[PDB]
Amino acid sequence: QLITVDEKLDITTLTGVPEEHIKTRKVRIFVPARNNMQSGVNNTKKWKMEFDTRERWENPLMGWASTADPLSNMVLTFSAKEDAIAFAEKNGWSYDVEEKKVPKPKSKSYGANFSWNKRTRVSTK
Amino acid sequence: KVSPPKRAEMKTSMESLIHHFKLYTEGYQVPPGATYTAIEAPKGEFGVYLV
Amino acid sequence: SNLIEVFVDGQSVMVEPGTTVLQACEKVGMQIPRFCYHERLSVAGNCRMCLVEIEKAPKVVAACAMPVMKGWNILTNSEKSKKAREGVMEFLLANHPLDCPICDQGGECDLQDQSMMFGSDRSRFLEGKRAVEDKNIGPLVKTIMTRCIQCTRCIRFASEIAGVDDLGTTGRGNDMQVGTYIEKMFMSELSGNVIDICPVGALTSKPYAFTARPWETRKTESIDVMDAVGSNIVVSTRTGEVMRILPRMHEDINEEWISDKTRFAYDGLKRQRLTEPMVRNEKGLLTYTSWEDALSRVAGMLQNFEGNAVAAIAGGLVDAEALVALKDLLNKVDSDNLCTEEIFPTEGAGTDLRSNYLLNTTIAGVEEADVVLLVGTNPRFEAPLFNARIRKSWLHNDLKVALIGSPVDLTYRYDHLGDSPKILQDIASGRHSFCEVLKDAKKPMVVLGSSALQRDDGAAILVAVSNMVQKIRVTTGVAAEWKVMNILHRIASQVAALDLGYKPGVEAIRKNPPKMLFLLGADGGCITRQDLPKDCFIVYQGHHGDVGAPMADVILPGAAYTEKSATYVNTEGRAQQTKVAVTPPGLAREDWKIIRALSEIAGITLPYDTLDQVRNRLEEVSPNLVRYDDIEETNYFQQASELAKLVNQEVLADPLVPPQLTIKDFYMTDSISRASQTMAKCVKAVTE
Amino acid sequence: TSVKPIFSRDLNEAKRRVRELYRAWYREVPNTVHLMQLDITVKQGRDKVREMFMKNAHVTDPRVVDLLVIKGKMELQETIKVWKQRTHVMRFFHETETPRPKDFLSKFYMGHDP
Amino acid sequence: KRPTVRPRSDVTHKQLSAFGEYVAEILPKYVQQVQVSCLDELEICIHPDGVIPTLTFLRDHTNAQFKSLADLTAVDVPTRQNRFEIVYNLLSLRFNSRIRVKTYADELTPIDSIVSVHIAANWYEREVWDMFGVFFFNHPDLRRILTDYGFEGHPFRKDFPLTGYVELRYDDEVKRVVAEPVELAQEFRKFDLNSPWEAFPAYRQPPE
Amino acid sequence: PSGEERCIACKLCEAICPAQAITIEAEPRADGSRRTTRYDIDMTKCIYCGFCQEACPVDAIVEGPNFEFSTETHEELLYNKEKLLNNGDKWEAEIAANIQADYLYR
Amino acid sequence: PTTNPPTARKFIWTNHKFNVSATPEQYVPYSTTRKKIHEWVPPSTPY
Amino acid sequence: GVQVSPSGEKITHTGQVYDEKDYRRVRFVDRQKEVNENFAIDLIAQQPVNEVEHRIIACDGGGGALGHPKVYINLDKETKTGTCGYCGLQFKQHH
Amino acid sequence: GLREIRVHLCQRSPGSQGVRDFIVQRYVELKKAHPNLPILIRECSEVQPKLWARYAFGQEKTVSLNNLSADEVTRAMQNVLSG
Ligand code: SF4
Ligand code: SF4
Numbered sequence A: 001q002l003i004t005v006d007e008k009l010d011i012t013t014l015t016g017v018p019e020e021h022i023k024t025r026k027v028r029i030f031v032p033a034r035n036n037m038q039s040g041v042n043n044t045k046k047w048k049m050e051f052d053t054r055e056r057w058e059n060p061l062m063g064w065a066s067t068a069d070p071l072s073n074m075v076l077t078f079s080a081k082e083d084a085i086a087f088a089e090k091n092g093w094s095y096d097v098e099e100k101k102v103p104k105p106k107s108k109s110y111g112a113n114f115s116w117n118k119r120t121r122v123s124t125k
Numbered sequence B: 001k002v003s004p005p006k007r008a009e010m011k012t013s014m015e016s017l018i019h020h021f022k023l024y025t026e027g028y029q030v031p032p033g034a035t036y037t038a039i040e041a042p043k044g045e046f047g048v049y050l051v
Numbered sequence C: 001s002n003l004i005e006v007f008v009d010g011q012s013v014m015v016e017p018g019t020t021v022l023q024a025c026e027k028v029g030m031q032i033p034r035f036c037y038h039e040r041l042s043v044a045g046n047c048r049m050c051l052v053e054i055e056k057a058p059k060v061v062a063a064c065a066m067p068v069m070k071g072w073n074i075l076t077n078s079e080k081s082k083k084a085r086e087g088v089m090e091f092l093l094a095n096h097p098l099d100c101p102i103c104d105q106g107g108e109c110d111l112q113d114q115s116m117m118f119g120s121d122r123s124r125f126l127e128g129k130r131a132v133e134d135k136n137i138g139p140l141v142k143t144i145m146t147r148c149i150q151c152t153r154c155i156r157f158a159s160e161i162a163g164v165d166d167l168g169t170t171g172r173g174n175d176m177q178v179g180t181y182i183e184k185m186f187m188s189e190l191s192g193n194v195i196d197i198c199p200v201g202a203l204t205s206k207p208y209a210f211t212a213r214p215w216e217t218r219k220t221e222s223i224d225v226m227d228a229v230g231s232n233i234v235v236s237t238r239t240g241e242v243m244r245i246l247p248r249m250h251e252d253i254n255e256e257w258i259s260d261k262t263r264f265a266y267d268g269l270k271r272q273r274l275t276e277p278m279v280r281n282e283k284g285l286l287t288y289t290s291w292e293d294a295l296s297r298v299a300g301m302l303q304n305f306e307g308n309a310v311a312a313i314a315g316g317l318v319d320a321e322a323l324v325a326l327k328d329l330l331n332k333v334d335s336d337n338l339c340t341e342e343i344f345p346t347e348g349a350g351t352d353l354r355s356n357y358l359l360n361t362t363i364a365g366v367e368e369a370d371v372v373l374l375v376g377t378n379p380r381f382e383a384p385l386f387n388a389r390i391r392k393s394w395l396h397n398d399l400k401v402a403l404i405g406s407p408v409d410l411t412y413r414y415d416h417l418g419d420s421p422k423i424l425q426d427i428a429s430g431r432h433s434f435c436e437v438l439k440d441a442k443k444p445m446v447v448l449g450s451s452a453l454q455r456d457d458g459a460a461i462l463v464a465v466s467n468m469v470q471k472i473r474v475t476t477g478v479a480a481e482w483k484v485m486n487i488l489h490r491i492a493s494q495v496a497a498l499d500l501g502y503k504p505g506v507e508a509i510r511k512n513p514p515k516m517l518f519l520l521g522a523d524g525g526c527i528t529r530q531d532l533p534k535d536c537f538i539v540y541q542g543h544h545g546d547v548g549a550p551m552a553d554v555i556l557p558g559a560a561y562t563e564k565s566a567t568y569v570n571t572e573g574r575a576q577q578t579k580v581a582v583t584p585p586g587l588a589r590e591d592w593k594i595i596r597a598l599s600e601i602a603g604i605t606l607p608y609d610t611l612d613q614v615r616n617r618l619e620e621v622s623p624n625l626v627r628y629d630d631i632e633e634t635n636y637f638q639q640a641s642e643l644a645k646l647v648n649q650e651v652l653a654d655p656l657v658p659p660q661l662t663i664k665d666f667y668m669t670d671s672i673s674r675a676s677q678t679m680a681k682c683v684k685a686v687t688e
Numbered sequence D: 001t002s003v004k005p006i007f008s009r010d011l012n013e014a015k016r017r018v019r020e021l022y023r024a025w026y027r028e029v030p031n032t033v034h035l036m037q038l039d040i041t042v043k044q045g046r047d048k049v050r051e052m053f054m055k056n057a058h059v060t061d062p063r064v065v066d067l068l069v070i071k072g073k074m075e076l077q078e079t080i081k082v083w084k085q086r087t088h089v090m091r092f093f094h095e096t097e098t099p100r101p102k103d104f105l106s107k108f109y110m111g112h113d114p
Numbered sequence E: 001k002r003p004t005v006r007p008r009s010d011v012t013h014k015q016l017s018a019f020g021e022y023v024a025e026i027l028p029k030y031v032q033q034v035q036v037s038c039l040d041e042l043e044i045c046i047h048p049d050g051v052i053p054t055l056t057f058l059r060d061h062t063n064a065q066f067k068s069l070a071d072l073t074a075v076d077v078p079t080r081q082n083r084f085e086i087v088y089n090l091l092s093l094r095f096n097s098r099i100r101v102k103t104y105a106d107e108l109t110p111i112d113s114i115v116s117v118h119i120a121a122n123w124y125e126r127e128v129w130d131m132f133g134v135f136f137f138n139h140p141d142l143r144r145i146l147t148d149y150g151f152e153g154h155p156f157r158k159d160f161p162l163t164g165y166v167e168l169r170y171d172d173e174v175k176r177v178v179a180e181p182v183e184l185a186q187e188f189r190k191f192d193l194n195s196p197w198e199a200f201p202a203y204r205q206p207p208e
Numbered sequence F: 001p002s003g004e005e006r007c008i009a010c011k012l013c014e015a016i017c018p019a020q021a022i023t024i025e026a027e028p029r030a031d032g033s034r035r036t037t038r039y040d041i042d043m044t045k046c047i048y049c050g051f052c053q054e055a056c057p058v059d060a061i062v063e064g065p066n067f068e069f070s071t072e073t074h075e076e077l078l079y080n081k082e083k084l085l086n087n088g089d090k091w092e093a094e095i096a097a098n099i100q101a102d103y104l105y106r
Numbered sequence G: 001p002t003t004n005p006p007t008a009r010k011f012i013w014t015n016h017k018f019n020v021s022a023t024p025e026q027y028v029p030y031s032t033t034r035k036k037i038h039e040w041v042p043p044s045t046p047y
Numbered sequence H: 001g002v003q004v005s006p007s008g009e010k011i012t013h014t015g016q017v018y019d020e021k022d023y024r025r026v027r028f029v030d031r032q033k034e035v036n037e038n039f040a041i042d043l044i045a046q047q048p049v050n051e052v053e054h055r056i057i058a059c060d061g062g063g064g065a066l067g068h069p070k071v072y073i074n075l076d077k078e079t080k081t082g083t084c085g086y087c088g089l090q091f092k093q094h095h
Numbered sequence I: 001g002l003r004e005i006r007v008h009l010c011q012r013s014p015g016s017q018g019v020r021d022f023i024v025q026r027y028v029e030l031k032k033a034h035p036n037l038p039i040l041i042r043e044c045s046e047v048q049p050k051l052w053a054r055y056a057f058g059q060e061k062t063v064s065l066n067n068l069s070a071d072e073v074t075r076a077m078q079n080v081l082s083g
């Protein structure tokens, strides 16, 4: 039988995460920007949740990249902006959302390259 | 697009080199789905549930 | 009410007339394979990779060019479409070189990736391949043209985005080669963008060459501060190191391009860096010390002087979280001499009304005007991506463009009204012949460059242009929601400084020289130890050792824009934020926490301990500095004009000559540009 | 805002299970200290019990308090049956870990972290 | 006949559709969806209230007799409200068939324990609780099974970091193994491998 | 055979390594060649799967026939580029003959 | 090898070297790259 | 070649060498800096330029399948040689 | 000692309608009265109108202008400019 819980969901105390990485961490909810070297748009559909970058330093022995941040490689994937916010909410991470950047629809026209009197007349194919 | 070509072809054909490069970096994409595969391993049913 | 209906595999789409088959498939979410087509270049139609079957037609149409006709069923995945793609991909690869392991594209190559998705897995080509000799077209773009697939994206980009009709195709048939025939350098403030739009490794970046692979790198979506356009960028890092800057798409700002300074000057972030606090020892030389030691000196001096005796100057690359922090500190010792190296006329309204010092029509408003009047500015170099948006309107919307100033080269044709700023008097009256155009303009746009307001008669020019626009607003009858008056800034921290009430220009310091000067990243060399009292305490906080550092008593190593989450406000007034890509080197610290650390040592602790609380404080001052990515409309220009008609200062007769005449002066302007070994090559490249 | 309960129907019926778990943990410190031959005092052990119960003093959702009680019983059982070792029990006391200063200046001197 | 593409069969897919309708007609109170994949595997997706009745019928019914619990496991999908998908893979030796029964859970909505149906599940439900923090009602002995004693967190949750938060070393000062915050000489390098081009037109999602 | 390194810093051995055991950095050389400035194998992460041998398009990285190289310290099992080139020169006579005996099966 | 000698190369070691672990010849790892971030050098003269 | 720094440490073929005051030099005390002495840059420069007749020549590095992927080099730019991007061999046209 | 006045307001929320009228009628006259004083007008969509005055040594006080009228705004601004 149901009960009334007049409070927002918080599961921080159950996740076994140190206090350090719940209160001082800022997540970034966003759709990745298209990699500009390629034309495919298949990595621009889902929402991502990433954590603020923390220090990396050089290992004295080898020069490798050392880290003391356990969440540096954490990348959650979500279907909707709302699902990503809820997940950060119930986990206590302070979030920061960026709206989806879609490519604005453009007017194309092959026949415009040969305009009798407009500057869109190309000088070379 | 799944099993890499022969090394001799990798060093001769432009399709073979590309497929070698993608298979050994990104790997092949598997269509979305789930499967439960089991075999009679020497100890008994050895199963993989793969998503 | 003219949206025809088309079908993509059966699903119906209502598209505008004139939409192509390729744009029709965008709407049902299907992306057509391509190489030659690019949404921001003129359609070419030669790669034939977009051939797509239309139901009931025998031949295959080029999806990227064929306009869509109502009642069509586009079969993006039929057998004809799949076979056309296999055949076409098979030809593209026949003469391509086995270069993927030595190619900087590999791992992010549209030719690699579209061959895996749409091509075949075999080669039946048993012949020899072609090999084309490479061209040397400058120190930024490496050409390995055997990899070219003759898609002509470079040719169209250069011609129509850079306005540099110097790339073309010579030869014919299978011997056809892209390039320049002669030996020319493709030097342009936008030339580095051919690296992005070239779909293969034919055009790659020399500075970046061989250094990393795409899968390795971590992408941090940040902003660019080399100028005031605030281009959205992506910073690739690998193992705590910055690899390359790439454009992030933002339709209303930089679209998909960045200037070469944005793209290639990051290597100045790795030289001449301040990594350790420094103080002067007994022989007068700077020596490394500790943070607790160094702050202890500045607090000790700050506790003495108050009021006019303490002043600060903000440089060209300072974040709003550090301007507001440095403002609060100095206001807590009575001082108000918070200044910026950039000059902005403080007569009339001054910075009272945002509309006075912003780009009120915005960057995307250029696309709607039908006349642009440029007053004292070389937009090609001050705002390279704003000149890109002008030429685009010059090309498509047939924008008329006029230039009051020097006859610089803008990459398009413009009417040169003259250089004497007496011409503003003429046009306002109605004498000048340009007014015949203005009477025919329903959307005028006057852009006054910040470079023209540095003149000794800066106030007069701004008042004149402010008045020539009050005649345009009634000589043409414009609506209240079309803004005509604009200011084009060239410094990243300028707009946010004025938002927070910094005094524009270092003129107050010349009036009342301070006994303590805070150089917060200032490097313009405006105030030198000959303008200041004998033995004056100077604290330099920055991230490069250039001009401010060697004259400092104390050096405080601050972060760079790649190394902090900071707020910058572009020329439109849009607020946007960077993000940490790497952390500051050595003992450098985030710039707003040094001033907060300093404030506690000196007993006047500031009321903020985290980035959150500092931005909340930014809100308390100017609440539009937390509205990220948002243009806040501003009115009350009429009021600023009414306060500008009373200024009794008059315009000198000096011709309006911008600081940058040629691409030579473009490459090295700020501290990071000057620490870059790639920009030094570019300077040496065009010079010799 | 209606949800299935785990065990408790509201916070008051859940605090009953909390105090009952705190009793059991309180009775077991003198044994853990005696059987595991820990080098602490009972008072110091019992204080540590109280410290862990107060780490979750802000929880209010009754379902959450059910799952903290469920976990705490599992932790109690791991200790009574000596499935844990000295190392495991002594991990609660963070004896080798220097604690990070909570003041701005000390953090500022020590690195980039907030 | 294609020497590279897997033989497709025909009869098995038809048989498992018939049994899927069978199961859905009989347990309409619990069944939410029935599907058969192109691999030819029957899936029953039930409301979590229906777990025990659904596995009981499938075990004891005469035209089912799925008497072996091949395994029980969870999948973490954070985008869903009920982020835990519980999967039961059952085996019928009588009919030489297999069947997958799936339900869901969240962090604060425990599932009933089927230990009364399949003793095999006893440790499987301990592993789900340990790795995903999904509580089971009426489990005879619900306690960690795979993680170290006093390990905090559920490491197979997608938001749990790969290397965890703590690590162990021997400290000669206190003469025992101690736990300390994790610092790696070399960080795990994340590779962005996804191709930006779509590989399967058959799974494309509408852009609505 | 001329003494030039085969490795061209393609980084495919690095992308495949199941253990993330290989670290690589590269830049243009003084003569413009594409070559590594760093090449490490942490032989304590390596699982000796041989996948890097398969991924290499120019037979630069191989697993030789040596198996008797146990050390007295952990640090000696972190191989940098100098060490790996030295193993190449040490074992080439035998590596070349094993590839000659097996490349036709590859 | 007395009947099938290995192919001669100018870089192949002439002198073998056995396991040098524990000795003063032992390998010692180090980073083979050069410094990345270059620091500013202050002027050597008063202002 | 194996230049030696003023500090006395050998310089590797990638130009690395610990500074004078870098403490990290302590790892070589009573031990040695592993350095490979056959600088590939120096060895590749010793090879003579192969002369060929045709204007386009294929290099696979030798050994066929035991070399590198087969590529072609243009030889038109009759002022510099054509260099293989894999093995670094040089080619020049006969006339 | 008054050092600076800041006026916040929305461009189109009626709660700030009174403040906008104050700007258009009085700002030009008020500025001529105090050519040296910095008076900052910083509009922002959907804010609460406010009036921040910063005094010597960083002391700041905020009068809230929500749902006032031009006459009631000029009085509040006159309080700050005077005493
Ligand atoms: S452009 Fe480079 S990576 Fe792409 S297919 Fe050609 S050689 Fe390979
Ligand atoms: S150089 Fe690049 S962009 Fe230009 S035609 Fe060749 S492939 Fe296309």
Ligand code: SF4
Pocket: F013, F016, F017, F018, F019, F020, F021, F022, F041, F045, F046, F047, F048, F049, F050, F051, F052, F053
């Ligand atoms: S053999 Fe070792 S180095 Fe090579 S891929 Fe396998 S784990 Fe990595």
Ligand code: SF4
Pocket: F006, F007, F008, F009, F010, F011, F012, F013, F014, F024, F055, F056, F057, F058, F059, F060, F061
């Ligand atoms: S060893 Fe082979 S796979 Fe690895 S980087 Fe060098 S050439 Fe590429």
Ligand code: FES
Pocket: C033, C034, C035, C036, C037, C044, C045, C046, C047, C048, C049, C050, C051, C062, C063, C064, C065
């Ligand atoms: S994309 Fe249409 S022909 Fe090239």
Ligand code: NA
Pocket: C105, C194, C195, C196, C197, C198, C199, C200, C201, C202, C203, C204
């Ligand atoms: Na390119």
Ligand SMILES: [Zn+2]
Pocket: H059, H060, H061, H068, H084, H085, H086, H087, H088, H089
């Ligand atoms: Zn070669």
